[PDB]
Structure formats: structure tokens, C-alpha cells
């Protein structure tokens, strides 16, 4: 619980790699001090449930682990969040999650921003406020969660007048530019959650997608191991309570004994496999780790090539490329590859995928490039491949 609370309260502004570094530092310190915390805790799963996760997925949320951690932060928060989102997916998710509670949308530059504020405050309506760069100081009494008690009410001093707090007024601040800084007073009273993609986040995305496409057996097996923590344990609780219900309903009618025996056998079999799943918890980890390590160079190459494409803006203003463009390139080379049919080796398909990735990326990028910089992009791609490949000196000097 200490590790989970530290992750929720502090982490959220940093990217995936920095979050992992902080988590492993805290875990190493905790295990050094002989504080009993379960090892290999999946903070994504330990702080949520299967139904909530699938509802998030169905409510327009990406399948990335970073997005699930951000959703966890958006659910378990004591200070109202400031969603940093270069894209628009986070706002779509926050509307889809609070649609039933008539979530009102507004902006800090809206002339009727104030009216929309006490309007939601009076009736306990969740409010999504965007464009937080032009921050309104009038929210200071709200963000601080200051309350005054009078006659059994809870009043807030929204300006000179007073408005009742109402049961649930949850506000969501947000922006769209990742490269913005705020004064520390605002930063102290707000929970920072960041949706910005980086090298590590895109590397994780590409690794997950390539493990989903190629070698689906390992991907689900890793999913089974991750769900082994609480999902199966919780799942069999329903069968146990249904057994209790059947026992009280039958009132000891052994006459249709096979009936109860049926579910009894179930409570046997699904137990054993779960216990069985406990046994190979370790040995599966090295298998999944090795399979992931096999596909790691492709993910690193994907991250490097995408960030090279993004940074290609500095040569010429015409070289503008979006993350969706590289995602389309990756999906085209992974699912629409003419060279991948008729070959099934799990080690040649990877090489074909890498080669075709580089080739199709060059083809799709150079067509929007003048015929005096194709050599530059090809050289950058060759250097990226040389860094990625194993068995060759880097020639850094």
C-alpha cells in the first residue's frame, strides 16, 4: 500500500521510464529495510478491477499500460487532476467516463466560465475545464478544498458570495501543450497526470503490439500471469458464494446430488489450474522475458525512427509527421505485409518485419521530401539500423 500510494501521489507527471525508475528505487529501499511488500506487484492491476478496466477500454481509452496508470490516477485522486494531453484522447475518455453524470465542458477563456462553474458546483456536476494556461485564480478556494460549516451545510467562498459545496463536484483541469510550465502554487494544489508519449512509452507500445501480432501464445500467457494476482482469486469467489447459495437453496436434497456434484467438480477443477498456475509463475516469467527480449530491437528501432521523423521538422518546415502516421506505417507493415504469407518461423518473420519496416518508412516519408534530402533520411535510417543490430561495433568515434 505504501508503494501504491507513493506511485499515485507523486508519479504522474514523469514518463514511463522515470516512473519505473522511481518505483524500482522505492522497492529496493523497502526490501533493503526488511519491510514486507509483495514482489513484482502490478500497480496497474492492484489498483483497479477487470470490469473497470474493460469499461475504460470500451469508453475510448488506449490499451497502453501508461494509459491504464493514468486512468488509475484519475480514479484515485485527492487533488483534482491536471490532464496533460498533446492529443485529444484523454478528454474523450474523461467525457465518456462521466457522461451519465452530465459532465459539463468549458474553457478558461470562455466568457461564461464563472457561470458554468457555480452552475456545476450547485448541483454537483463534474466539470471539464480545458486550456489551463490562462488559469483563473478564482479556482483557488476550490482546489484547496477549503470548507466552512454553518448549520450543517458545507459552503465555499467562490468570490465574495458563498456557494454550497454539494455532494460531488469533481473538476478536471486540462491542457493540450506538453511544453508548458506553471507557477509552483498551482502545481502544489493539483494532481499531475501526463499523457504525453515519449521514447520509452512508444517502445512499450510497439513491443506490446508486436507481441500481440506475432507469438500471440506468449502474449496471452503473460496476460494470464498478470491476471493470476487478483483476477482468478476474485473470480473463484463468485463460484464459492454460488456454492453457498446452492447449499442453502437445496436444503440437503441429496436426491439430485449429481446436480450439486456438478458445480462441486467445477470448484475442484478451476481450483487446481489456479494452483497449477501458481507453480509455473516463475518459469513462465523467464520464457516471457526471453520472448520480449527477442523483439526488443524492433521496438527500439521503432521508437528511434518515429522520433527521427518527428524531429525532421528542423531541416524543413514541410516535414511535419504525426504519431498516427507512424502508427499507420507500423500497422501496415505488421498486418498488410505481402512478404509475410507462407513463412512461419518466429525468427525469420521478425527479420522480414524489420527490413520491410525500414523500407516502407523510407518510401512513405521520402515521397513528401525534396530530391535533395532522401540521402539524409536514408543515412539516418542506416545509422539507426547499425545501432540496433547486434554483433557490430558502434563506430561512435
Amino acid at each position: 500500500c505504501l508503494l501504491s500510494a507513493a506511485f499515485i501521489a507523486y508519479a504522474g507527471y514523469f514518463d514511463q521510464q522515470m516512473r519505473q525508475n522511481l518505483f524500482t528505487t522505492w522497492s529496493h529501499h523497502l526490501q533493503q529495510a526488511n519491510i514486507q511488500f509483495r514482489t513484482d506487484i502490478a500497480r496497474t492491476e492492484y489498483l483497479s478491477n477487470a470490469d473497470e478496466r474493460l469499461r475504460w477500454q470500451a469508453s475510448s481509452l488506449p490499451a497502453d499500460d501508461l494509459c491504464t496508470e493514468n486512468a488509475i490516477m484519475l480514479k484515485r485522486f485527492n487533488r483534482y487532476p491536471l490532464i496533460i494531453d498533446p492529443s485529444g484522447q484523454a478528454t474523450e475518455f474523461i467525457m465518456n467516463e462521466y457522461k451519465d453524470r452530465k459532465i459539463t465542458r468549458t474553457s478558461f477563456l470562455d466568457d461564461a466560465f464563472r457561470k458554468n462553474l457555480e452552475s456545476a458546483l450547485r448541483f454537483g456536476n463534474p466539470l471539464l475545464v480545458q486550456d489551463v494556461e490562462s488559469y483563473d485564480p478564482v479556482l483557488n478556494p476550490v482546489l484547496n478544498r477549503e470548507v466552512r460549516r454553518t448549520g450543517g451545510r458545507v459552503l465555499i467562498t467562490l468570490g465574495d458570495q458563498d456557494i454550497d459545496l454539494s455532494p460531488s463536484f469533481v473538476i478536471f483541469l486540462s491542457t493540450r501543450d506538453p511544453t508548458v510550465e506553471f507557477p509552483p502554487d498551482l502545481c502544489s494544489r493539483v494532481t499531475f497526470v501526463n499523457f504525453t508519449v515519449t521514447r520509452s512509452s512508444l517502445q512499450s507500445q510497439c513491443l506490446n503490439e508486436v507481441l500481440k501480432a506475432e507469438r500471440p501464445d506468449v502474449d496471452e500467457k503473460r496476460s494470464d500471469l498478470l491476471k493470476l494476482q487478483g483476477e482468478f482469486q476474485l473470480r473463484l469467489r463468485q463460484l464459492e458464494k454460488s456454492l453457498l447459495q446452492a447449499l442453502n437453496e437445496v436444503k440437503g436434497r441429496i436426491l439430485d446430488d449429481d446436480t450439486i456434484i456438478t458445480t462441486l467438480e467445477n470448484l475442484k477443477r478451476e481450483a487446481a489450474e489456479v494452483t497449477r498456475k501458481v507453480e509455473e509463475t516463475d518459469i513462465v516469467m523467464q520464457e516471457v522475458e526471453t520472448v520480449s527480449q527477442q523483439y526488443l530491437p524492433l521496438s527500439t528501432a521503432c521508437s528511434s525512427i518515429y522520433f527521427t521523423m518527428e524531429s525532421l521538422k528542423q531541416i524543413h518546415f514541410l516535414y511535419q509527421y504525426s504519431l498516427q502516421f507512424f502508427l499507420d506505417i507500423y500497422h501496415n507493415v505488421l498486418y498488410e505485409n505481402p512478404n509475410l504469407k507462407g513463412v512461419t518461423d518466429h525468427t525469420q518473420r521478425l527479420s522480414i518485419i524489420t527490413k520491410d519496416l525500414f523500407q516502407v518508412a523510407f518510401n512513405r516519408v521520402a515521397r513528401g521530401m525534396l530530391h535533395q534530402d532522401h540521402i539524409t533520411f536514408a543515412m539516418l535510417l542506416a545509422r539507426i539500423k547499425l545501432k540496433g543490430t547486434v554483433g557490430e561495433p558502434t563506430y561512435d568515434a
Binding site: 460549516r149 502544489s188 494544489r189
Partner: protein, 199 residues
């Protein structure tokens, strides 16, 4: 300030003999305080004779109702005023220490025939809550009194709990001391959320 010190120590003849040593120690420390803590380090490291005037004024206010005070009490008041004037605005712990050892060594050098009561009583806390006048108080008695006052204040208004660690007590004493005088304008500077508005 030699004239000011002699007139200030007229409240009792047992302290007049030390007027010249007190002035010399007061000037020496100031010179050292002006030698270091230059402008180009932080934008508020200025030290004018206004600090000396505030020094002798505070000492005179502390000695106004007190009578028959030994020399060590006068040195304690002098050290307390020096701390409250020349190290409240310091921004790093190393300079706070530098000030502490330097005030200690200046007092030792200019007063080599005194007890070291201030050394053991390093906190050097003065308050007028427990006693009517401005008598130095113990850390724990002040903490208990502030705890009782906070217990009353919780139900009085702003029912938010606070913990009483030593820096809170020091800051409360400083702000009360500033609020006493009928010109007190305060500028609390620090990280947002450390307890400026609350205290």
C-alpha cells in the same frame, strides 16, 4: 551606537560597565555580516545601519520592564536579537550555521568572563505568553501552550490539524514578535504549502 548603548543600559548600573564591550561586539558582528552576504548572492542580502537601529531598539524594548538582570541575560537578549535580525532571511543551512558559530565566537571573544548559558540554551526562545513581560521560555512549555491554543483554535475556526515541530514554533514566535510592534509588515517567502498562510 556607543551613545545609544550607554543610554539603554541606564536602567541598571550593574550593566553600564559593559556598554563599550557590547557596542564593540555589536559593530564587529555587523561588519562580518556586511563582509559576507553580499548583494550578488541573493537579491535581498542588504545590511544597513537600520539593522543596528532595530537591534538597539529591540534590546531596549526587552529591557524596558526587566530589572536587575545579570550580564548573561543581557548577552542572551543581544544574541537573540542578532539571530532574529541577521539569520532569519538566510536561504541556506550552511549560512545559518556560519552565523551561529560566528555569533558564538564574537560573544566569546568580547566577553571572556561570562557563563555559557546561551550555548546550552541554543534554541534561544523568547515569548510573552507564559509571563507578562518578555522572558525567555523553554521549548517544551512553549510547545504545550501552543498545543492548547491550537486545540482551542481548531474548534474556533479552520478545523485543519497541524503538527508542532520546532520550526513551526520558531516561525510562530517570529511572526508574533513582528506583529507586536505597531508597524509590523511581514514578507514570508518560501515554497508554496510550507505553512505561511496557515501560521
Amino acid at each position: 551606537y556607543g551613545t545609544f548603548n550607554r543610554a539603554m543600559l541606564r536602567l541598571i548600573p550593574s550593566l553600564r560597565t559593559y556598554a563599550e564591550p557590547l557596542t564593540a561586539a555589536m559593530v564587529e558582528f555587523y561588519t562580518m555580516s556586511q563582509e559576507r552576504f553580499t548583494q550578488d548572492t541573493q537579491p535581498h542580502y542588504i545590511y544597513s545601519p537600520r539593522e543596528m537601529t532595530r537591534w538597539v531598539r529591540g534590546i531596549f524594548e526587552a529591557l524596558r520592564p526587566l530589572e536587575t538582570l545579570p550580564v548573561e541575560g543581557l548577552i542572551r537578549i543581544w544574541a537573540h536579537e542578532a539571530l532574529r535580525l541577521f539569520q532569519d532571511r538566510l536561504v541556506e543551512d550552511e549560512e545559518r550555521r556560519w552565523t551561529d558559530e560566528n555569533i558564538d565566537t564574537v560573544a566569546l571573544k568580547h566577553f571572556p568572563n561570562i557563563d555559557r548559558e546561551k550555548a546550552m540554551s541554543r534554541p534561544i526562545l523568547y515569548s510573552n505568553w507564559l509571563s507578562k513581560d518578555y522572558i525567555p521560555v523553554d521549548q517544551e512549555e512553549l510547545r504545550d501552550y501552543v498545543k492548547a491554543r491550537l486545540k482551542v483554535f481548531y474548534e474556533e475556526e479552520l478545523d485543519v490539524p497541524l503538527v508542532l515541530f520546532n520550526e513551526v514554533l520558531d516561525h510562530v514566535l517570529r511572526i508574533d514578535r513582528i506583529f507586536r510592534q505597531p508597524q509590523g509588515h511581514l514578507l514570508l517567502i518560501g515554497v508554496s504549502g510550507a505553512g505561511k498562510t496557515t501560521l
